[PDB]
Write a protein that binds this ligand. Structure first.
Ligand SMILES: [Zn+2]
Ligand SMILES: [Zn+2]
Ligand SMILES: [Zn+2]
Ligand SMILES: [Zn+2]
Ligand SMILES: [Zn+2]
Ligand SMILES: [Zn+2]
Lengths: 9, 71, 71, 79, 9
């Protein structure tokens, strides 16, 4: 599924 | 599209929002619901635990919000 | 239309579309960018915005089309 | 079969897999074909055999933490 | 890379 702000900092 | 009221019980508010998931900083994590034309919801409003959110983000599986999961 | 693998691919070298920042541009954009199909061979889907197509052109094209990289 | 479970599907234009004729090929298969995930676009799964992956290449890919792009997408300028 | 049916048997 496409998400937002799920990128690992 | 971030500061929308994503569902009848939406708790994400631009005047009160704070990071909840370890991947959030100044914006709320969102996931795409594939129902009908589709629409975006705040992951937190769906009560998704973080690992579930992450797994969804790493796969190609479709997602349906708590409102649309049932046919 | 509906591209096989989504609306979030980087369509061209200049691809400006980011799912985390993408906002509606065309008078029609809800939750996904507008795409068109370049028929150059295999044929690939490209973002209308990235081809700097003005809405009247977009709407009009919807014979055949070829992206900026192929004409 | 039922494609909703993800195995018995047509993974690519040259996909050979069909529950009626499939047979185990890799040493790790039982009643289901081994599959690997392609990170192209929104993603998708393809049968390892359809990609012509040799067992040690497939097992090597699974033990590592790298993304994989199928033979159909790997050459698409992914900038 | 994620995989299915690739576990040691
Ligand atoms: Zn919400
Ligand atoms: Zn929904
Ligand atoms: Zn683009
Ligand atoms: Zn083209
Ligand atoms: Zn296949
Ligand atoms: Zn692929």
């Amino acid at each position: 599924a496409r998400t937002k702000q799920t990128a690992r900092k | 599209g971030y500061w929308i009221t994503c569902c009848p019980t939406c708790d994400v508010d631009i005047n009160t929002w704070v990071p909840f998931y370890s991947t959030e900083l100044n914006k709320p994590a969102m996931i795409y619901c594939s129902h009908g034309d589709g629409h975006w919801v705040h992951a937190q409003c769906m009560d998704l635990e973080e690992r579930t959110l992450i797994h969804l983000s790493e796969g190609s599986n479709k997602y349906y919000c708590n409102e649309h999961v049932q046919i």
